[model samples]
Target chain A: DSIRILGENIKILDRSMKTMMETMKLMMEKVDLLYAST
Target chain B: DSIRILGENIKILDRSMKTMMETMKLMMEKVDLLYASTAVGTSAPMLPSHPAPP
Candidate 1:
């Protein structure tokens, strides 16, 4: 029922967050490089 | 029953995402300000402004 729906959505959200974290990690690296160079 | 439990976990996940988004927003702002004066140009990373379902 609704429980199954919620579980599916939760899994989707978890995947989304993992992608977000990877993006953030890359952004942080870019910023670190910028600071290190200048 | 299980619905309530799932509801609670979803709420927690939503809150965590909200917090994470806010922190990233702050970091983006800082980086944007640093690049504002320089010739170097880079797009700021941002999350879409969307409210989670309740």
Candidate 2:
């Protein structure tokens, strides 16, 4: 059970990182635009 | 070596998540302020550029 959970957690970690990276990228872009606007 | 590195990797994962969480928190604050600015029709100041915490 522990081993199975560990493997699943690894997959979850990868997907989570991908989403986090994308979200951060979007946030950076928005910040850039907001600064540019005013 | 493999076993030793596994322990190190676990520690690393904890630290990495802490940094990631902090970054996400800042992003949330920025979004909230941006939304409030839009809703109120006020000019909000931009947050300073962020560098990842060491």
Candidate 3:
């Protein structure tokens, strides 16, 4: 279930970030999903 | 799929390593398709908090 997407370790990096960071990260995640489909 | 692609930049750091490792730690998981299919195949006695395989 744990998978990294970008330059950072998705798992570790997410936990280290604040709530706002989480939001930003999730945005990138959405882009990733779209990118994957494209 | 069981291969480390490249650098440890995207490491799937499994939980049970430490409580506060500041990484991708899973308190528990969904176990939906990923676990359901491999649940019985991954562990024997099902060591939840230990780093052992099924």
Candidate 4:
């Protein structure tokens, strides 16, 4: 019962974590490119 | 002058983001424990170390 609930919460956390990582990675690349170009 | 400074700040942000992610993982584990245990609590655990999630 609680296992499924906890699993769902963990899944949400996992998704959020991955999204944040990807967003940060993209931002870093953009910053790097801007720095290199200028 | 400012560009270099901004780049340095972004590097710091990158590092902070990684640290925050790791901390979140740890909190999730802790929450998992509290939920599994027969603890008397219905409220979700709050993570004081970092800002609220999006």
Question: Of models 3 and 4, which has the larger TM-score?
Answer: 4
Kindly report the fnat of each predicted structure, to 2 decimals: 0.06, 0.00, 0.00, 0.00
Better DockQ candidate (2, 4) = 2
How many collisions per candidate? 0, 0, 6, 0
Docking class of 4: incorrect
Q: After superposition, how far is residue A13 of candidate 2 from its true place, in Å?
A: 0.8
Q: Rank by lDDT, descending? A: 1, 2, 4, 3
Extract clashing residue pairs from model 4. Answer: none
> What ranking of all candidate models by DockQ puts the best one first?
1, 2, 3, 4
- Tens digits of per-residue lDDT for model 2 on A1-38? 75576668777777767666766775775666667766
Rank order by TM-score, top first?
1, 2, 4, 3
User: What ranges in model 4 sit over 4 Å off?
Assistant: B1-54
Give, for candidate 2 chain A, the lowest lDDT window spanning 10 residues: A22-31
TM-scores for candidates 1 onward, in order: 0.63, 0.58, 0.22, 0.39
Candidate number achieving the greatest DockQ relative to the actual structure: 1
Give the TM-score of candidate 4 (chain A).
Answer: 0.75
Residue pair clashes in candidate 2:
none
